[PDB]
Design a protein around this nucleic acid. Structure first.
Ligand SMILES: [Mg+2]
Lengths: 678, 105
DNA sequence: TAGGCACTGG
DNA sequence: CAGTGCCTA
């Protein structure tokens, strides 16, 4: 087993030069540095570990080091280099599994300061290295009277860089051994720093293998990217901006500008007593100025001020439809009586309240809808074009958006998305959603050989969360709930229980039940907010004893205040639980997350087994995985049909693999883009 | 006997009135404005026949002040034949104002 | 819409 | 950094 790390001249996307690398070999207990002219030897060493059926450990190697080495070997040495997935270990991936209850800077992309809770020490250091190196470079130059350029520290190899490289491997080795010291995931009787790859995966907790496979596949998904219709979004941008201006023109006419205090630097005090008046806006008292400037009658002073005469400095302000403060100011002045305020003390003005607001003036009453529309349009513009993370700012040269994915960003095993967040694109049911979704599609990628548009296969797991509930209930109801889902009407069944009016309300109720929603959210489904919210849940459980039995066995496992602060996930991993009340929900959500994770992994492995190649230079390409659905780009319709049926096969395999008490299914849809494939 | 203007009446009451007119741009929430207010009441009485004192609350009539800039309040503008002849900003004393007026009148 | 990401205002 | 919206049931 070897631990390694490399330093190169840029992020994966534009890297062109290997600066150096370091290898620590457990078999020799020695660190070896490789400088620029040793690139070839570095590669030879990695492949030799592979020849021995060994393991290579990197920190974030799955997303950077491994693919960057393949890219660099080809560019600099005209060599084909492809480390197999089976021989690689990623301490970042392992940390996210073992310390899933903690957040991380995602390798320095996020400001540690904004993250909640504590951060794992070794991991924190690794993620801050680049910024740290940049600060040492910046200094050495600033000390030699030499100018600094934004990112020149990464242009050429140097000994300071080499030192950081070596430090990286020492810290990664420390992290690794710390992770491996966790007996829950690695049996104590085995020295995992002294075994072959097959033994490492087979003898460690199943979750270890699943997380590495998920990370490898998702790294490939990121590199694939999601084909994006830049031109269409630009046209959408023009349309949105025009409607924004017009809405602004109207609203600014309806609500005119006004003045507000600004720049005051002196407390206003009652001239009579001298009593400070902190409530009154700040004033300014001119030190110079007079009626007739300093000297037969003198000359009049053309200045606007007069020494000692105070005034309140003010600035002109124009109505801003995006300012909740301005909206609140203008509406109360119309006869609106704020019913709900915030904790920081302030009128609550979300879209909900704006809908209930009523004012006498008919024009101001109608303007509220214009304000609502302005806020929504502002939302669409920020997301697609003007925000810092706008889609138009992320489209790469290959005409695709390569959004990032943290495979295990949630403690339940659920993944998170960012840069940009491709799991928050407006749905087809939302205003402008159809245009937004149609812009992300396999059709926007023209085959490298034939120029023909690719086709899209959208696959979703069917009612996964409910089926997971059925599965866990089987120990108590012997599969009754699961049978009703597959061959009956679970919703009307849930309606009769908890006694509800519409069967659609049953659905609303259950889907909210699975995602531990407060009693309040339950009430709003009937129209008794937070009131019947306690009654409903209770009546449901009463008529569905298997669920109450489950909740009870779940809490007995945790509460003795705690005998254990986690539940065992489907692959054996610990899943932190915040409160006993959340136990069940955590259980269900984790089951769904892990089933979908293993599912997408098996789906891709089966496709490859069938002879299909993963990549734009191949037959299919994973473009997006959003909770329970995956969107896959396919070179031909025939392939898309194969992907759809293969995904169903993979899901059944997963249900059988984990002895699931409820049958699992998927539903697939073929089409040119995400608007049609959802 | 002070003239309480509105945006709609400003043009006629000020820019077309005969003689000098002292306009006071103020706000209810301004300490300095509340200070000079009673002073304005007195000047209006003592200069009756020689000067016309007018007031414009900028919150009730937001369309006029912008036309003259106004960076602070109270802003006292002396008009003559529909044009600004003199301007002072701040809560002047009855004396400084009396001096400002006599000097400009 | 519970959890995350991200935006605009001040 | 506060107040919100957008996704996912
Ligand atoms: Mg590195």
């Amino acid at each position: 087993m070897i631990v390694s790390d490399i330093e190169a001249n840029a992020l994966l996307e534009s890297v062109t030069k290997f600066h150096c690398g370091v290898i620590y070999d457990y078999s020799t207990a020695e660190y070896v540095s490789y400088r620029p002219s040793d690139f070839g030897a570095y590669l030879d060493a990695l492949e030799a570990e592979v020849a021995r059926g060994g393991l290579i450990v990197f920190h974030n190697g799955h997303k950077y080091d491994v693919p960057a080495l393949t890219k660099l070997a080809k560019l600099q040495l005209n060599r084909e280099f492809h480390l197999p997935r089976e021989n690689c270990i990623d301490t970042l991936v392992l940390s996210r599994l073992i310390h899933s209850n903690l957040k991380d800077t995602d390798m320095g992309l996020l400001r540690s300061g904004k993250l909640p809770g504590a951060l794992e020490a070794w991991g924190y250091r690794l993620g801050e290295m680049k910024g740290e190196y940049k600060d040492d470079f910046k200094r050495m130059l600033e000390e030699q009277g030499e100018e600094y350029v934004d990112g020149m520290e990464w242009w050429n190899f140097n000994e300071e860089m080499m030192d950081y490289n070596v430090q990286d491997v020492v810290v990664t080795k420390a992290l690794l051994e710390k992770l491996l010291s966790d007996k829950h995931y690695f049996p104590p009787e085995i020295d995992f720093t002294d075994v072959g790859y097959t033994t490492f995966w087979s003898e460690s907790l199943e979750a270890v293998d699943i997380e590495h496979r998920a990370a490898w596949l998702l790294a490939k998904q990121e590199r694939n990217g999601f084909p994006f219709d830049t031109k269409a979004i630009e046209e959408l941008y023009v349309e949105l901006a025009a409607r924004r201006s017009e809405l602004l023109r109207k609203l600014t006419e309806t609500f005119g500008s006004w003045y507000q205090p600004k720049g005051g630097t002196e407390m206003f005090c009652h001239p009579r007593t001298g009593k400070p008046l902190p409530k009154y806006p700040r004033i300014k008292t001119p030190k110079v100025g007079g009626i007739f400037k300093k000297p037969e009658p003198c000359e009049l002073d053309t200045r606007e001020y007069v020494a000692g005469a105070p005034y309140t400095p003010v600035e002109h302000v124009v109505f801003n439809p995006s300012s909740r403060d301005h909206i609140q100011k203008k509406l109360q002045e119309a006869g609106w009586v704020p019913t709900k305020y915030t904790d920081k003390g302030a009128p609550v003005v979300d879209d909900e309240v704006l809908e209930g607001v009523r004012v006498d003036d008919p024009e101001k009453q109608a303007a509220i809808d214009l304000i609502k529309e302005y806020l929504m349009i502002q939302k669409r513009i920020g997301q697609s074009a003007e925000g810092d993370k706008a889609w138009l700012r992320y489209v790469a040269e290959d005409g695709k958006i390569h959004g990032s994915v943290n495979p295990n960003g949630a403690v339940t095993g659920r993944a998170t998305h960012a840069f940009p967040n491709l799991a928050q694109i407006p749905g087809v049911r939302s205003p402008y959603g159809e245009q937004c979704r149609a812009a992300f599609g396999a059709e926007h990628h023209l085959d490298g050989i034939t120029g023909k548009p690719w086709v899209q296969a959208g696959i979703d797991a069917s009612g996964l969360e409910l089926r997971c509930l059925a599965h866990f209930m089987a120990r108590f109801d012997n599969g009754e709930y699961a049978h009703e889902i597959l061959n009956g009407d679970i919703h009307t069944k849930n309606q009769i229980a908890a006694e509800l009016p519409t069967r659609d309300n049953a659905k609303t109720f259950i889907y909210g039940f699975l995602y531990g929603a407060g009693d309040e959210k339950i009430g709003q489904i009937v129209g008794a907010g937070k009131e019947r919210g306690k009654e409903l849940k209770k009546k449901f459980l009463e008529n569905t004893p298997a669920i109450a039995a489950l909740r009870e066995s779940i809490q007995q496992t945790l509460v003795e205040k705690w005998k254990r602060r986690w539940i065992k996930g489907l692959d054996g991993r610990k899943v932190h639980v915040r409160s006993p009340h959340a136990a069940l929900n955590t259980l269900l959500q984790s089951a769904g997350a892990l089933i979908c994770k293993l599912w997408i992994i098996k789906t891709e492995e089966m496709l490859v087994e069938k002879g299909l190649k993963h990549g734009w230079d191949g037959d299919f390409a994973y473009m997006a995985w959003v909770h329970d659905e995956i969107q896959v780009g396919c070179r031909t319709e025939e392939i898309a049909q194969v992907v759809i049926e293969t995904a169903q096969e993979a899901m059944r395999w997963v249900g059988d693999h984990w002895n699931f008490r409820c049958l699992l299914d998927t539903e697939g849809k073929m089409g040119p883009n995400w608007a049609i494939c959802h | 006997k002070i003239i309480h203007l509105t945006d709609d009446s400003f043009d006629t009451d000020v820019l077309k009135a005969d003689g000098a007119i002292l306009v006071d741009f103020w706000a209810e929430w301004c300490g300095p404005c509340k200070m000079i207010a009673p002073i304005l009441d007195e000047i209006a009485d003592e200069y009756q026949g020689k000067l016309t004192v007018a007031k414009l609350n900028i919150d009730q009539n937001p369309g006029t002040a912008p036309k003259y800039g106004i960076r602070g309040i109270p802003t006292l503008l002396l008009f003559k034949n529909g044009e600004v002849a003199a301007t002072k900003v701040g809560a002047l004393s009855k004396g400084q104002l009396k001096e400002f007026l006599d000097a400009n009148l």
